[PDB]
Amino acid sequence: EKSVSVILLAGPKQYIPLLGQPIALYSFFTFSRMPEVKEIVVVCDPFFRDIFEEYEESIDVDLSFAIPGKERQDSVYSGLQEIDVNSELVCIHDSARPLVNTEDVEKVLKDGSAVGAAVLGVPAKATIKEVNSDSLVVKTLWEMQTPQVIKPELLKKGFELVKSEGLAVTDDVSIVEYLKHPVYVSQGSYTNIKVTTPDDLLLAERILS
Amino acid sequence: EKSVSVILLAGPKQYIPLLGQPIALYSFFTFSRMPEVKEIVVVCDPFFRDIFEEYEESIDVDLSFAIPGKERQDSVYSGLQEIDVNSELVCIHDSARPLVNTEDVEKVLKDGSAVGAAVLGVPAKATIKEVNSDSLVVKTLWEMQTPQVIKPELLKKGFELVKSEGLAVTDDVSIVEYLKHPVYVSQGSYTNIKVTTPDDLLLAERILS
Ligand SMILES: N#Cc1cnn2c(O)c(Cc3ccccc3)c(Cl)nc12
Ligand SMILES: N#Cc1cnn2c(O)c(Cc3ccccc3)c(Cl)nc12
Ligand SMILES: [K+]
Ligand SMILES: [K+]
Ligand SMILES: [K+]
Ligand SMILES: [K+]
Secondary structure: OOOEEEEEEEOOHHHOEEOOEEHHHHHHHHHHOOOOEEEEEEEEOHHHHHHHHOOOOOOOOEEEEEOOOOOHHHHHHHHHOOOOOOOOEEEEEEOOOOOOOHHHHHHHHHHHHHHOEEEEEEEOOOOEEEEOOOOEEOOOEEEEEEEEEEOHHHHHHHHHHHHHOOOOOOOOOHHHHOOOOOOEEEEOOOOOOOOOOHHHHHHHHHHOO | OOOEEEEEEEOOHHHOEEOOEEHHHHHHHHHHOOOOEEEEEEEEOHHHHHHHHOOOOOOOOEEEEEOOOOOHHHHHHHHHOOOOOOOOEEEEEEOOOOOOOHHHHHHHHHHHHHHOEEEEEEEOOOOEEEEOOOOEEOOOEEEEEEEEEEOHHHHHHHHHHHHHOOOOOOOOOHHHHOOOOOOEEEEOOOOOOOOOOHHHHHHHHHHOO
8 A cells, every 4th residue: 555656647639538537637546546556746748737736635645746858768757756765666657548447557566566567468459560671571469558567676777777878768668678677468458548539539438438 | 454363351340331331342442443453252241242243344353252261261262262263463351441542552462463472561559569478578560451462372382281281370471471482561551440340430431531
């Protein structure tokens, strides 16, 4: 209980309402009601702080804020600077995923605690293949979602390594890929979609019923 | 000209209308108007033959039919048995992809002719990772679409090898993966979606405007 700090990424499609509520507030509330969660560090343009700020006394978590940066990793880093000095786990979530299930958050938190780093994923349904520089097929794949859950010292070491040795950040689990620590893939739900265009918004409404 | 035989897979979501026309007819017509295409072998439950049969004298291709089988590869094989004895290329298409562009069909036909086997693909947008049996991340991916275009002798040899040596067919390019022949990935369009649920159907309508 109160061992997890959520970094909620909300640096605009994550504020378009879903049944009257901005998309970013759904996951915000899902996390707030979990007794595991001590605090939520919201990463957002200060223009939208109000959207979250209205609910501070009514939620049972500490609310903090962080300034976004140029790339997703910069926004992750900024949020990381604000967590309780004794948080055992950081839980990084894309606010564009409003429909994440509490049960799946529970699973990835559990796996993150056990393993050190964990991320929600689902089996990739489509035929997906590695392709080389000459456009030829190179002769189980999982699609990643969020939360991404990691022990703060682990993530700090990852940022430290990328920084000092000047490494290339390419995708959403690139930083830990440079470390030798294992990353567990917690099996999630296909309903935990990223809601970035009006067609997704419609999906979200059907899932919400 | 008249060098390509299309195997149109329509073995029910591919007959739900899109702006009044069953989904399966969109690609059917796209292929019919191409002077490269000699014939279309439609693979469908005979219950729906009429849907295609109505247009035979008005299209400029020979129309043939084949019975589906249990798995997609069986349906591919059945269609293969019906093509002109002198077709230089077979063009396999999932009728659930109604929005394929003529220009992209032209590209994959060109690449299939040059290389021997080619398939439309797009860069996979999501973070996708290989995961091992212990649920851990294994430390460019492309999403495949159709058409899949192949020289008929190449595809026949592939079915022959899988059959005689009893190999496991897993995904949509599995059969050729056993051969040493290269498979080219022709860059397609994100609009060439597979339309399997009412939300896709809505996507299709927006793309169609
Ligand atoms: N942006 C961004 C980004 C790039 N890499 N990377 C990363 O490795 C983690 C850490 C992490 C990875 C997997 C599972 C949990 C945590 C997080 Cl949270 N973000 C990023
Ligand atoms: N079902 C099914 C199926 C499984 N494998 N496989 C395959 O290799 C090809 C041939 C092909 C592959 C890549 C590019 C063109 C053709 C086709 Cl057409 N279908 C299948
Ligand atoms: K380590
Ligand atoms: K999407
Ligand atoms: K060969
Ligand atoms: K779909």
